[PDB]
Amino acid sequence: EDYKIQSFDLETQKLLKTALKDPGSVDLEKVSSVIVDQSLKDQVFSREAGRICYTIVQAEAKQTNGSVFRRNLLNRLQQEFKAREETRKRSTQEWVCLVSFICNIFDYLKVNNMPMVALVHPVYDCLFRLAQSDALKNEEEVDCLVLQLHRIGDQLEKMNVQLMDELFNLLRDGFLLQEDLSSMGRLLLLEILEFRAGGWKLSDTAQKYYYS
Amino acid sequence: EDYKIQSFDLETQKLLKTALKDPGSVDLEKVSSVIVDQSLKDQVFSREAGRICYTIVQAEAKQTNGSVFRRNLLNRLQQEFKAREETRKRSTQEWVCLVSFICNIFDYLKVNNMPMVALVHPVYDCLFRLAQSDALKNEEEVDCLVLQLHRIGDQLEKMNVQLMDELFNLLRDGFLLQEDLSSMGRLLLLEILEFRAGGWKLSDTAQKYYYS
Amino acid sequence: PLGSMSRIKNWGDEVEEQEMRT
Amino acid sequence: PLGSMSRIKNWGDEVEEQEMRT
């Protein structure tokens, strides 16, 4: 019901609501474009845009059996994904938005009730970037990293265990060895180590220790 | 078969081997005494004396239906346990031996196939001591702490969860907050956090990260 | 044709390739 | 008798108390 589009221009709200009911009536290319655009600019939308993207994807399959919108969306994302490093340089905020959005898409947009394998390596590419020592020193990126691991970390591991394992080695490494990792960064990494080791769930006692 | 008594005087080896077959023939009070004595002096024996103690306990129940030896052993241990702080002052080595021995007894000596509840609080008393910041700064004690948690940590939690939970809060606390915790101390604590969170087992990937 | 840019890695394509393969 | 030193906490006792209680 709530797709979280309040950040949008009033005209565009109408465009998006229209696409949900009658995809065929709107420019799905311009619709995917305004969604990716906004997703890189607003944090709440970046973590929630998957809902509306899924609704539209389903609406088009129902109405015309087409997957044009899915296709414009994936290809526009792939382009932002290819330019991830440049975007990170320009704005850490935009970059964490990109990662949150890609990962939200991986969570929401399925393909015959299965995850898109097209996004498995690109998500790991993103999380491995966050696990680097130049990224870990920024609580903003660590926050981003553990958000994705909380939300889709489990699904990701099923697709590829080898990558998850090597990723978490970087997390232990940063944890023990890095010195400009902050207190918050340390609390965030330690919680996620416990979180995975417990089978991607938060224990009652951990809940008490880490969170208000 | 191996009770690990090679550290013993040749005469005492004979005494101990005798007690295993024919408890009634020997002074079980002097037998328990030489076992506790040695347990505080030799590290390999402190972590293995439970085997021989169990064998003797069973031998006496079989032969005479008595639990004299069990009783002298428990009461002598209780006395060392009461004097734990003084012993720690005198020798860290003796103190980690005491803890290893108590915990080995908790593991081996059962009571109708169930753990001795008499030792539940005293073991927690010992491990909480190790989790203190003055103890954690010594790799020797941290080593001791994680040895017990590896061996009986699971059993202990079943008897009392509340204590285990509060104990592990001290472990996270020392981990994040203490500065004179050493690198080894950090690796040891992090492994045990993962170890518990995983249901008291070592994951394949953790095995690779932590241990040769 | 093999190696042509139509075959160059494309998320949209990979997903269709998966959808029909499943 | 209640409170007497025979009742004072004793590991040997506690274990017998458990063994018969089980």
Side-chain angles (χ1 to χ4, degrees):
Chain A
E1 288 285 292
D2 194 11
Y3 303 104
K4 307 251 156 72
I5 62 174
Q6 305 77 3
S7 50
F8 275 102
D9 172 345
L10 219 53
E11 298 183 354
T12 309
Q13 311 224 5
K14 200 187 178 186
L15 178 52
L16 296 164
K17 291 175 190 165
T18 308
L20 298 170
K21 324 299 184 310
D22 192 6
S25 55
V26 290
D27 197 334
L28 290 176
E29 173 140 279
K30 189 188 182 176
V31 158
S32 68
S33 178
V34 306
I35 281 165
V36 184
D37 281 347
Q38 181 69 1
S39 83
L40 312 178
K41 279 180 182 181
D42 170 90
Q43 325 200 138
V44 190
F45 187 61
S46 73
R47 323 185 214 104
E48 299 310 329
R51 302 164 177 178
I52 207 185
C53 284
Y54 166 93
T55 301
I56 300 180
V57 161
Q58 300 286 280
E60 194 198 335
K62 192 194 188 182
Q63 174 179 85
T64 63
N65 197 242
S67 64
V68 180
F69 168 81
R70 191 231 250 147
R71 194 193 172 82
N72 302 333
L73 184 76
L74 283 175
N75 290 337
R76 161 70 189 277
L77 256 194
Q78 177 173 16
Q79 274 165 357
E80 301 282 350
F81 169 74
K82 285 191 182 181
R84 58 185 180 282
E85 223 71 65
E86 190 72 299
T87 286
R88 180 171 180 254
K89 263 187 100 155
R90 179 178 66 253
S91 164
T92 291
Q93 300 244 350
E94 290 193 38
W95 150 246
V96 312
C97 277
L98 178 74
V99 176
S100 281
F101 184 37
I102 304 184
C103 288
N104 209 219
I105 294 302
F106 182 76
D107 201 18
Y108 286 88
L109 250 54
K110 262 75 179 312
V111 166
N112 297 343
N113 228 29
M114 296 318 291
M116 299 177 161
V117 351
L119 295 210
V120 172
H121 205 255
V123 167
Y124 273 115
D125 277 339
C126 286
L127 307 190
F128 265 90
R129 195 45 185 89
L130 295 172
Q132 299 305 311
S133 66
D134 65 316
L136 286 183
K137 59 155 163 60
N138 305 336
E139 304 181 0
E140 200 181 356
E141 317 205 58
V142 185
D143 208 12
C144 182
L145 172 64
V146 309
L147 174 60
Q148 317 318 326
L149 286 172
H150 284 145
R151 292 185 163 192
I152 65 172
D154 193 10
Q155 276 177 74
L156 255 200
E157 180 176 71
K158 266 137 192 185
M159 316 294 311
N160 198 316
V161 200
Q162 295 85 0
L163 291 184
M164 196 55 84
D165 272 345
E166 203 53 81
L167 170 67
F168 273 70
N169 289 338
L170 285 165
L171 303 191
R172 298 183 182 91
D173 272 359
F175 203 95
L176 300 156
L177 306 183
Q178 185 150 342
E179 294 170 56
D180 61 351
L181 183 61
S182 80
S183 298
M184 196 60 51
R186 295 211 137 80
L187 295 174
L188 294 176
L189 293 186
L190 189 56
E191 190 281 338
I192 207 63
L193 289 171
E194 291 198 71
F195 187 86
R196 177 188 198 203
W200 306 97
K201 29 211 173 88
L202 173 63
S203 66
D204 280 344
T205 189
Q207 216 300 2
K208 294 191 194 170
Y209 185 93
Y210 292 108
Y211 311 107
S212 298
Chain B
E1 288 285 292
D2 194 11
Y3 303 104
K4 307 251 156 72
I5 62 174
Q6 305 77 3
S7 50
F8 275 102
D9 172 346
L10 219 53
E11 298 183 354
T12 309
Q13 311 224 5
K14 200 187 178 186
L15 178 52
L16 296 164
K17 290 175 190 165
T18 308
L20 298 170
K21 324 299 184 310
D22 192 6
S25 55
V26 290
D27 197 334
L28 290 176
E29 173 140 279
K30 189 188 182 176
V31 158
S32 68
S33 178
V34 306
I35 281 165
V36 184
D37 281 347
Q38 181 69 1
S39 83
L40 312 178
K41 279 180 182 181
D42 170 90
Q43 325 200 138
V44 190
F45 187 61
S46 73
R47 323 185 214 104
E48 299 310 329
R51 302 164 177 178
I52 208 185
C53 284
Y54 166 93
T55 301
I56 300 180
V57 161
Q58 300 286 280
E60 194 198 335
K62 192 194 188 182
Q63 174 179 85
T64 63
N65 197 242
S67 64
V68 180
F69 168 81
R70 191 231 250 147
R71 194 193 172 82
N72 302 333
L73 184 76
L74 283 175
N75 290 337
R76 161 70 189 277
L77 256 194
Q78 177 173 16
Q79 274 165 357
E80 301 282 350
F81 169 74
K82 285 191 182 181
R84 58 185 180 282
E85 223 71 65
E86 190 72 299
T87 286
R88 180 171 180 254
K89 263 187 100 155
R90 179 178 66 253
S91 164
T92 291
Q93 300 244 350
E94 290 193 38
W95 150 246
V96 312
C97 277
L98 178 74
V99 176
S100 281
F101 184 37
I102 304 184
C103 288
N104 209 219
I105 294 302
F106 182 76
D107 201 18
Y108 286 88
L109 250 54
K110 262 75 179 312
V111 166
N112 297 343
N113 228 29
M114 296 318 291
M116 299 177 161
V117 351
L119 295 210
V120 172
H121 205 255
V123 167
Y124 273 115
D125 277 339
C126 286
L127 307 190
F128 265 90
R129 195 45 185 89
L130 295 172
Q132 299 305 311
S133 66
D134 65 316
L136 286 183
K137 59 155 163 60
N138 305 336
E139 304 181 0
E140 200 181 356
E141 317 205 58
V142 185
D143 208 12
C144 182
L145 172 64
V146 309
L147 174 60
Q148 317 318 326
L149 286 172
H150 284 145
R151 292 185 163 192
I152 65 172
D154 193 10
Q155 276 177 74
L156 255 200
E157 180 176 71
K158 266 137 192 185
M159 316 294 311
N160 198 316
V161 200
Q162 295 85 0
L163 291 184
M164 196 54 84
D165 272 345
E166 203 53 81
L167 170 67
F168 273 70
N169 289 338
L170 285 165
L171 303 191
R172 298 183 182 91
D173 272 359
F175 203 95
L176 300 156
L177 306 183
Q178 185 150 342
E179 294 170 56
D180 61 351
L181 183 61
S182 80
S183 298
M184 196 60 51
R186 295 211 137 80
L187 295 174
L188 294 176
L189 293 186
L190 189 56
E191 190 281 338
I192 207 63
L193 289 171
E194 291 198 71
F195 187 86
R196 177 188 198 203
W200 306 97
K201 29 211 173 88
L202 173 63
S203 66
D204 280 344
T205 189
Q207 216 300 2
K208 294 191 194 170
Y209 185 93
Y210 292 108
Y211 311 107
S212 298
Chain C
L2 289 188
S4 60
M5 67 170 172
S6 69
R7 284 190 145 79
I8 280 295
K9 181 149 62 201
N10 189 269
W11 290 4
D13 284 339
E14 296 195 300
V15 167
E16 287 156 18
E17 180 186 3
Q18 178 199 346
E19 192 183 25
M20 279 145 225
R21 200 167 168 100
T22 73
Chain D
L2 289 188
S4 60
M5 67 170 172
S6 69
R7 284 190 145 79
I8 280 295
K9 181 149 62 201
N10 189 269
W11 290 4
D13 284 339
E14 296 195 300
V15 167
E16 287 156 18
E17 180 186 3
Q18 178 199 346
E19 192 183 25
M20 279 145 225
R21 200 167 168 100
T22 73

